[model samples]
Target: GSSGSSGTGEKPFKCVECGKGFSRRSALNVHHKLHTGEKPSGPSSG
Candidate 1:
C-alpha cells in the first residue's frame, strides 16, 4: 500500500541507500548511513 493507517504495520521512513524500511525517521536516518559505512560515534559526539 502507498499509505498505511496508524494501527497498521507501515513504515514511513525508508532508507533509500538500502531500500530498507523503518517505522520512525530517526531509525531510517541511522539505517541510511549503514550503506555508506557511517556509524554514530556516540551520544556525546554530537
Candidate 2:
C-alpha cells in the first residue's frame, strides 16, 4: 500500500523549494505548483 504522508520515512519525493518530501509523486507534483506560477490545464480546445 502507498502511504499518504511526507518525510524521509518511506517517502522519497523531495521538493527543491521547501525541501518537503512526499510519498506519492502526484502529491509532489501538485505541491510543486505552489512554487511555480503555472495554471492547471485540462483538455485543450481545437
Candidate 3:
C-alpha cells in the first residue's frame, strides 16, 4: 500500500503560471511556453 498523502502521486508537479497540475516536470516545461512568449532556441545562422 502507498503512503496516505505524504509525497503521494497526486500531480506533485504544478505550474505557477496557472492552476494546472502536470504529472511530469517535462510536461510543465512545455506548458510554461503558453504563458511565456519565448520560443525555442533556433539553430546557428552559420
Candidate 4:
C-alpha cells in the first residue's frame, strides 16, 4: 500500500457509494466490483 503524497492528502479514487477511500485507482476499482455483486477471481503468480 502507498501513502497519499498530495499536499491535501486527497484519496482521488474514493467510492461515493460505500464511502471507501483508496490510495490507488486500481485498488479502488477492485473493491468496486464487490459492491456490484461480482465474484472475486484468482490471479496468476507474478
TM-score of each: 0.49, 0.52, 0.53, 0.51
Q: What's the lDDT for residue 8 in model 1?
A: 44
Candidate 3 lDDT by residue in tens digits, 1-46: 7667665456888888885788888999899888876467875487
What are the per-residue Cα lDDT tens digits for candidate 2 across 1-46?
8877653364589888887878888898889889976477675679
TM-score of 3: 0.53
Q: For candidate 4, what is the total of clashing residue pairs? A: 0
Clash count list over all predictions: 0, 0, 0, 0
Ranking by lDDT: 3, 2, 4, 1
Superior candidate under lDDT, 1 versus 3: 3
Candidate 3 stretches greater than 4 Å from native: 1-9, 38-46
| lDDT of all predictions | 0.70, 0.79, 0.79, 0.76
lDDT at position 34, candidate 2: 91
Off by over 4 Å in 4: 1-10, 38-46
Give residue 1's lDDT in candidate 3 (0 to 100). 75
Model 4: pairs clashing at backbone N, Cα or C within 3 Å? none
- Total backbone clashes of candidate 1, pairs 3 or more residues apart or in separate chains: 0
